[PDB]
Amino acid sequence: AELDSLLGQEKERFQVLPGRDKMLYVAAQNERDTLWARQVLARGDYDKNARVINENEENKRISIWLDTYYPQLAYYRIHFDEPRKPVFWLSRQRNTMSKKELEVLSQKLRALMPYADSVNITLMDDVTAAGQAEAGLKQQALPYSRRNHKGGVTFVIQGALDDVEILRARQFVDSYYRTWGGRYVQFAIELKDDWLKGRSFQYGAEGYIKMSPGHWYFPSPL
């Protein structure tokens, strides 16, 4: 009685992989499917050892391990489109490593993932990431402000936003995060009683002058 025969009438929905620790790994696409699988094992419909996995859970677990043994590595995300050959995106500028060090890192990752045959390490450009973020906001025509730090970039979107703006914003952010992960760019959405949508000015003898950003804001009377 194979495990695939127990998961259901739809077959392609799940993917079964053998691992070097002599254990079966079931790859799922989402939470709902993950629980649909986990019920089978925990019920005890299968006799040997098995485990269920997904992209989000493994990203978390790997990050927890990196936090301990490589506490200063700058990286983005691990993609599992082909679960036998993951792709690990590292920053080109923020990391200094030798080729040898990169190889060792690769081997230790392979030791953490007994279901993977090899891990491909790829270097990505931060300017590229930041640019694609800004272009996506301009393309949606959301109002925003950008702030830069030595280790990251923030976009703040705030004010009395309209329903359409909210919808489009939340869709875009959800899309981008899936590609680049949260580790470098943060998007903050905050509603305020402010019709200027975060712009601010001072009136002097020379007329209007644009204020620097900040925490405090003038709640609109209008």
Binding site: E31, D163, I166, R170, V173, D174, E190, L191, D193
Partner: peptide, 28 residues
């Protein structure tokens, strides 16, 4: 919420929805 929900991004929807259910409410 269900597991894996970006809570920060979801507070906005709730505030927006509740604001208009009453004659006078401020996001604050």
């Amino acid at each position: 919420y269900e597991r894996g929900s970006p809570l920060a991004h979801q507070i906005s929807d709730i505030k927006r929805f509740l604001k208009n259910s009453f004659a006078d409410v401020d996001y604050d």
